[PDB]
Amino acid sequence: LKVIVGALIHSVKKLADVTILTIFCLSVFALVGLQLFKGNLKNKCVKNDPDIYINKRGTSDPLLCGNGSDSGHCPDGYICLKTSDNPDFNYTSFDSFAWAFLSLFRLMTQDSWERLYQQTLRTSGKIYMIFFVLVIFLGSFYLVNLILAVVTMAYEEQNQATWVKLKTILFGLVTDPFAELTITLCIVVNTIFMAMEHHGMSPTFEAMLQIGNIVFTIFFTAEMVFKIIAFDPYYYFQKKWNIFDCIIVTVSLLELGVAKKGSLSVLRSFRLLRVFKLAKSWPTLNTLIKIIGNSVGALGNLTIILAIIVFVFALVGKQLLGENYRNNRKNISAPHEDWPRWHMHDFFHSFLIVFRILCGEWIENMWACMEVGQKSICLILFLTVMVLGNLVVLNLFIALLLNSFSADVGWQVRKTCYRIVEHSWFESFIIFMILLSSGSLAFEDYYLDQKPTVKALLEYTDRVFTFIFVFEMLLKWVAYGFKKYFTNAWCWLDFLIVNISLISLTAKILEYSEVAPIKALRTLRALRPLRALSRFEGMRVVVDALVGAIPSIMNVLLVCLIFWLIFSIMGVNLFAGKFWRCINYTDGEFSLVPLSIVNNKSDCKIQNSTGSFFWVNVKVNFDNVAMGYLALLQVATFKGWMDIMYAAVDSREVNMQPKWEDNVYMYLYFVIFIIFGGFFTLNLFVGVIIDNFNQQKKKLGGQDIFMTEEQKKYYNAMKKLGSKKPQKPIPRPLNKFQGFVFDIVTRQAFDITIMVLICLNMITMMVETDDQSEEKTKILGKINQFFVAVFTGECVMKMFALRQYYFTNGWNVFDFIVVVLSIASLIFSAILKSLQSYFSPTLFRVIRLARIGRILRLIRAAKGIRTLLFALMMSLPALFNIGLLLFLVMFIYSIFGMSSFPHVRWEAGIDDMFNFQTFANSMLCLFQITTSAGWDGLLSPILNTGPPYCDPNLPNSNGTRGDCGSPAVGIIFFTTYIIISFLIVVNMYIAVILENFN
Numbered sequence: 002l003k004v005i006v007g008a009l010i011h012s013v014k015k016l017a018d019v020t021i022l023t024i025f026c027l028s029v030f031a032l033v034g035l036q037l038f039k040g041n042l043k044n045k046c047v048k049n050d051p052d053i054y055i056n057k058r059g060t061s062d063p064l065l066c067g068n069g070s071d072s073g074h075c076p077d078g079y080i081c082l083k084t085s086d087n088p089d090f091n092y093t094s095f096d097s098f099a100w101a102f103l104s105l106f107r108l109m110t111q112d113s114w115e116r117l118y119q120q121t122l123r124t125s126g127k128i129y130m131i132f133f134v135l136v137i138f139l140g141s142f143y144l145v146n147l148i149l150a151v152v153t154m155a156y157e158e159q160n161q162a163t164w165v166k167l168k169t170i171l172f173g174l175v176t177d178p179f180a181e182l183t184i185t186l187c188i189v190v191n192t193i194f195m196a197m198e199h200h201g202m203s204p205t206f207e208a209m210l211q212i213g214n215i216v217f218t219i220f221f222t223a224e225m226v227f228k229i230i231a232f233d234p235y236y237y238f239q240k241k242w243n244i245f246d247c248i249i250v251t252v253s254l255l256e257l258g259v260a261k262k263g264s265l266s267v268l269r270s271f272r273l274l275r276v277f278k279l280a281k282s283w284p285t286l287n288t289l290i291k292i293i294g295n296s297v298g299a300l301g302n303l304t305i306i307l308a309i310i311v312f313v314f315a316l317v318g319k320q321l322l323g324e325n326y327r328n329n330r331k332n333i334s335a336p337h338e339d340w341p342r343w344h345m346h347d348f349f350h351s352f353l354i355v356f357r358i359l360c361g362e363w364i365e366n367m368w369a370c371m372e373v374g375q376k377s378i379c380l381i382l383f384l385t386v387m388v389l390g391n392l393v394v395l396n397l398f399i400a401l402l403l404n405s406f407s408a409d410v411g412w413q414v415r416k417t418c419y420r421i422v423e424h425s426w427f428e429s430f431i432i433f434m435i436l437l438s439s440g441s442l443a444f445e446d447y448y449l450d451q452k453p454t455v456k457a458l459l460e461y462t463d464r465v466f467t468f469i470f471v472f473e474m475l476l477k478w479v480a481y482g483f484k485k486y487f488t489n490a491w492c493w494l495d496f497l498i499v500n501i502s503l504i505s506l507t508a509k510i511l512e513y514s515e516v517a518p519i520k521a522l523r524t525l526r527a528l529r530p531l532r533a534l535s536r537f538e539g540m541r542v543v544v545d546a547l548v549g550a551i552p553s554i555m556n557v558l559l560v561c562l563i564f565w566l567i568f569s570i571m572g573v574n575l576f577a578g579k580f581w582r583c584i585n586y587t588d589g590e591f592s593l594v595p596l597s598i599v600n601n602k603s604d605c606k607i608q609n610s611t612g613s614f615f616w617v618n619v620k621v622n623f624d625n626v627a628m629g630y631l632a633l634l635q636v637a638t639f640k641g642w643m644d645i646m647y648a649a650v651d652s653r654e655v656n657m658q659p660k661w662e663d664n665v666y667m668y669l670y671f672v673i674f675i676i677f678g679g680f681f682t683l684n685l686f687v688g689v690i691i692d693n694f695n696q697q698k699k700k701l702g703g704q705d706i707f708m709t710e711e712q713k714k715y716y717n718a719m720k721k722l723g724s725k726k727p728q729k730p731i732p733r734p735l736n737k738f739q740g741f742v743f744d745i746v747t748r749q750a751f752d753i754t755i756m757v758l759i760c761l762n763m764i765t766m767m768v769e770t771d772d773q774s775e776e777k778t779k780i781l782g783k784i785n786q787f788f789v790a791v792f793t794g795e796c797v798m799k800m801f802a803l804r805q806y807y808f809t810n811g812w813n814v815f816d817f818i819v820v821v822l823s824i825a826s827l828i829f830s831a832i833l834k835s836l837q838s839y840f841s842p843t844l845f846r847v848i849r850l851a852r853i854g855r856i857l858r859l860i861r862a863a864k865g866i867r868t869l870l871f872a873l874m875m876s877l878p879a880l881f882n883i884g885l886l887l888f889l890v891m892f893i894y895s896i897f898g899m900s901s902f903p904h905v906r907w908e909a910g911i912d913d914m915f916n917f918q919t920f921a922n923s924m925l926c927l928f929q930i931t932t933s934a935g936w937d938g939l940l941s942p943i944l945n946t947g948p949p950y951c952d953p954n955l956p957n958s959n960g961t962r963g964d965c966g967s968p969a970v971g972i973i974f975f976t977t978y979i980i981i982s983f984l985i986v987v988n989m990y991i992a993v994i995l996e997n998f999n
């Protein structure tokens with residue numbers, strides 16, 4: 002027992018340092034947030050007229066508004082006041098450290114951090130984007146990387162630790178190579194015929210599909226009969242793949258003999274599994290099948306323990322909270338429906354709740370589970386499931402990732418021009434004329450219409466810039482030469498950009514600025530910032546590194562697309578066009594008509610006596626295979642996963658009003674898709690990526706990636722600083738006056754005392770709350786002097802002792818800086834207390850931030866936190882280059898969105914402050930969706946194409962389609978951005994992982 006106890010202490014010691022780092026960073030950021038905005042979110046609107054709150058369209062909750070300029074304003078007739086109630090159920094805010102640590106925890110884990118990021122900005126202001134980017138990068142991305150690296154190192158160390166029929170049979174053995182190609186082509190054609198379905202399905206089309214299925218079944222059955230006849234059970238049946246083929250074909254002909262053909266729709270797509278037969282031709286698909294098999298096979302024990310854990314947690318939650326869930330339904334249920342959409346009453350819903358927790362969404366059900374049970378018991382269960390659940394899942398993801406993978410005078414002029422081009426006077430000029438040109442696009446926003454001078458200046462700048470670029474291009478042509486220029490890869494990335502701009506501007510100036518293709522091309526002017534990729538050394542290097550994996554990414558992309566086509570043909574069959582519903586739309590907010598009044602289309606048509614009954618489809622549905630792909634991508638990115646998963650369960654059949662959870666068991670389809678097209682299809686992409694960088698690195702022979710030569714030598718210098726830190730030993734003072742001061746300073750317990758004092762300062766900083774007694778305010782202020790005075794005295798003592806000898810140490814300079822900063826902050830506060838200098842309290846609470854600079858002293862005294870911070874220090878250049886590339890991508894998409902969706906109707910995620918009409922708002926939205934959070938909410942107001950959800954007919958300034966977007970371009974934009982950002986962030990994670998690996 003003692004041996005296993007010690008073993009458990011071990012394998013936790015591995016995460017000891019990372020856990021302490023997480024706790025300390027969370028505490029520091031909690032203190033920063035608490036000081037910045039405490040009890041600020043409780044700023045609901047109240048009508049000047051008891052309490053009168055207005056509600057934002059589409060949401061019953063009150064509207065958090067705040068005083069300031071950046072912060073979100075409030076409708077006329079309302080004054081933002083510190084109404085005493087927190088926005089979400091009264092359970093989310095920064096009014097105290099205990100409520101600030103949890104908010105930062107859920108901001109690190111990223112669960113629904115979109116709401117927090119758009120609330121705290123609405124209240125405090127837009128300028129607070131800095132805190133959120135900092136906590137996401139330094140907090141979320143960094144801490145998850147380090148935890149993943151800890152688990153990876155632990156498990157890597159574990160891994161490396163240890164008659165007539167006979168005549169026909171003779172003639173039936175043709176088995177020509179043409180036969181296998183023919184059968185494979187037959188499989189592909191069967192799939193492509195079964196993958197062309199839709200809502201229309203004219204009778205001729207239905208008959209054609211039926212006869213096609215019949216003939217293909219006939220061919221497959223004839224082939225199986227011929228093979229079994231030619232072979233015997235010992236030869237034919239003995240094969241695993243033959244058994245699979247026989248099972249699928251017999252399940253296809255039995256249903257082909259059923260009364261209701263594939264009425265189940267699970268059997269109408271059971272034959273579709275045969276596409277696995279393409280495993281022979283496809284190595285990547287073979288590897289995917291191997292991944293799944295070994296996950297269920299050799300590595301099946303880990304999955305079994307995961308499943309039993311999830312089942313046990315779901316059962317415990319049900320048994321403990323179902324009675325309260327039923328007794329208090331009205332407390333958490335939606336305004337109209339009588340039951341919560343997600344609850345824990347019966348085992349199925351408890352298991353779905355636990356799966357939602359494991360999926361990365363827990364607070365939404367946490368809050369509600371607090372207003373139906375004791376806060377203590379419901380808080381433990383929700384947190385323990387997350388930590389244990391996400392640890393066990395990431396334990397499988399690595400186990401699968403380590404077993405399947407790795408287990409005349411003209412020529413003189415030409416030469417002169419060639420030499421001139423290489424000159425710095427032109428190179429640097431072009432580099433910063435490519436930066437200014439890219440930057441100038443940010444001012445082309447929707448509000449630009451209101452500043453005629455600004456747009457005129459911008460168009461002058463654009464014309465001059467394109468003229469300059471044409472001159473540069475023709476000079477480069479006349480110097481370098483046609484073949485030399487066109488050989489390079491980037492040379493033509495500039496040529497096509499220049500031509501796009503040229504033809505667009507020529508069309509505009511030719512009084513032909515009305516052609517739809519011309520307008521679309523002009524909308525592609527967001528490609529101008531792309532021109533800065535070649536010039537910058539680091540961005541060019543990272544671009545080359547990324548392009549080095551296109552061959553290794555295309556195969557996995559194709560395999561994922563096929564394995565998703567299967568699930569997009571299973572979903573289209575199970576439920577197509579069955580998502581339509583009859584809604585009642587009185588104001589923005591609408592209530593689907595109860596099935597008592599209208600239960601089908603004609604009823605919703607004859608009872609239109611209210612003037613508002615509407616029959617409209619869900620925004621994301623399963624009508625055809627393209628929408629199936631979109632609705633599977635939303636479930637894979639885990640955003641919009643409920644609007645298309647609620648429609649599924651409430652639908653009954655074609656042209657019938659959805660009923661409350663009639664298809665309560667249709668959640669299994671989405672659960673299965675999540676499992677397979679997620680944990681078993683991203684694991685493939687990741688393994689392929691960790692072998693395409695491991696290769697090409699062993700090929701590079703250790704050459705650093707994402708880094709230039711100057712950055713490499715700087716990295717080497719810093720690596721030496723990792724051992725050069727110590728300076729010469731300090732001589733002891735000779736005179737008693739300085740000698741006694743020195744020998745008192747340098748002592749066994751001096752450092753312990755200073756650390757304890759910093760800990761006490763942290764304690765007295767965290768005891769702070771919102772709206773506390775004036776007595777406690779005075780106490781904190783006075784103890785905020787007992788500490789600043791003491792630290793300044795100690796710093797001046799150590800400065801007097803040893804004179805300039807100690808100044809050589811860098812961190813001594815750092816702590817001197819923090820102490821003098823505290824003194825300066827106190828002086829500034831005292832001076833600003835005057836009657837002449839008065840500003841918002843935010844200025845007080847931001848100047849008071851110097852204390853955290855004064856409590857960062859523990860870093861120099863830390864054990865492993867300092868090592869991890871050193872690793873981050875070394876990795877900074879690589880992450881800087883990748884961040885430059887990511888910001889360039891974000892800028893491209895910002896310009897695209899600003900040009901394309903500045904008129905959509907403000908619904909769901911979009912608001913009056915998170916629109917696309919301004920560059921700041923566009924950057925805010927793109928930063929939010931960079932992690933694929935709320936992208937569904939931003940997409941939904943674009944999918945709308947007709948009334949009432951959007952009014953296609955609406956002046957909308959000059960906006961076309963009124964308040965309705967273009968679903969095709971919206972889907973392309975958002976899907977491309979999320980995929981590209983996933984690639985860039987996984988590059989960042991790989992860079993950090995390898996930097997810590999060294």
Ligand SMILES: *[C@@H]1O[C@H](CO)[C@@H](O[C@@H]2O[C@H](CO)[C@@H](O[C@@H]3O[C@H](CO)[C@@H](O)[C@H](O)[C@@H]3O)[C@H](O)[C@H]2NC(C)=O)[C@H](O)[C@H]1NC(C)=O
Nearest residue numbers: 596597598599600601602603604605606607655656657658
């Ligand atoms: C939409 O749903 C409604 C209600 O289900 C359908 O109307 C219904 O039509 C049926 C068949 O005519 C009616 O059944 C009949 O009821 C009368 C007595 O009212 C009885 O004498 C007949 O023998 C038969 O049982 C049903 O009552 C009627 N319900 C109502 C209130 O309208 C409607 O046809 C559906 N429309 C579509 C196209 O989905």
Ligand SMILES: *[C@@H]1O[C@H](CO)[C@@H](O[C@@H]2O[C@H](CO)[C@@H](O[C@@H]3O[C@H](CO)[C@@H](O)[C@H](O)[C@@H]3O)[C@H](O)[C@H]2NC(C)=O)[C@H](O)[C@H]1NC(C)=O
Nearest residue numbers: 583605606607609612613614615616947948949952954955
């Ligand atoms: C129930 O009755 C209402 C009212 O007739 C129907 O709404 C109507 O829907 C049509 C088609 O969407 C609308 O046509 C267009 O509407 C826009 C926006 O008003 C307008 O700009 C166009 O000129 C054109 O009229 C129609 O206006 C709209 N009428 C109203 C006032 O709602 C609804 O479709 C009916 N629903 C059912 C299921 O019977």
Ligand SMILES: *[C@@H]1O[C@H](CO)[C@@H](O[C@@H]2O[C@H](CO)[C@@H](O[C@@H]3O[C@H](CO)[C@@H](O)[C@H](O)[C@@H]3O)[C@H](O)[C@H]2NC(C)=O)[C@H](O)[C@H]1NC(C)=O
Nearest residue numbers: 584585586587588591592593594595598610611612613614
């Ligand atoms: C479906 O939508 C319609 C239209 O919004 C709803 O009817 C509307 O109900 C409101 C009351 O919530 C009516 O406003 C007021 O009603 C009171 C009734 O005493 C009246 O005294 C006021 O002068 C005022 O009219 C509104 O007029 C009425 N509009 C109509 C005629 O459709 C309907 O209740 C909704 N039904 C469901 C089940 O969602």
Ligand SMILES: CCCCCCCCCCCCCCCCCCOC[C@@H](O)COP(=O)(O)OCC[N+](C)(C)C
Nearest residue numbers: 488489490491494541543544545546547548886890981
């Ligand atoms: C949204 C994009 C995010 C970034 C990732 C995706 C990038 C896609 C590709 C964009 C750039 C495509 C052109 C640049 C990539 C290829 C080039 C990538 O770097 C070029 C070096 O590999 C080779 O140098 P050069 O091509 O200048 O010339 C050397 C001699 N050879 C190579 C010509 C024989």
Ligand SMILES: CC(C)CCC[C@@H](C)[C@H]1CC[C@H]2[C@@H]3CC=C4C[C@@H](O)CC[C@]4(C)[C@H]3CC[C@]12C
Nearest residue numbers: 240241242243244245246248267268270271274
């Ligand atoms: C309802 C449909 C669409 C989804 C479920 C598909 C199921 C039934 C599939 C996926 C995994 C498949 C099995 C995979 C492996 C083997 C072993 C082989 O020696 C015979 C076939 C057999 C036993 C398959 C039978 C069919 C199977 C169980």
Ligand SMILES: CC(C)CCC[C@@H](C)[C@H]1CC[C@H]2[C@@H]3CC=C4C[C@@H](O)CC[C@]4(C)[C@H]3CC[C@]12C
Nearest residue numbers: 487488490493494496497498499500501502504
């Ligand atoms: C049409 C206008 C706007 C832009 C024209 C850009 C032209 C010159 C660019 C666009 C894409 C380029 C091609 C992209 C990739 C390759 C493969 C390489 O192995 C040989 C050159 C070749 C074939 C390039 C030749 C130049 C090219 C065709």
Ligand SMILES: CC(C)CCC[C@@H](C)[C@H]1CC[C@H]2[C@@H]3CC=C4C[C@@H](O)CC[C@]4(C)[C@H]3CC[C@]12C
Nearest residue numbers: 097098099100764767768769770771773774777
């Ligand atoms: C190691 C310790 C500090 C970890 C945290 C301990 C717990 C008990 C801390 C976390 C936040 C703390 C609270 C933060 C702020 C206030 C307001 C103050 O006017 C009274 C104390 C009170 C209400 C604190 C009580 C103790 C508290 C709940």
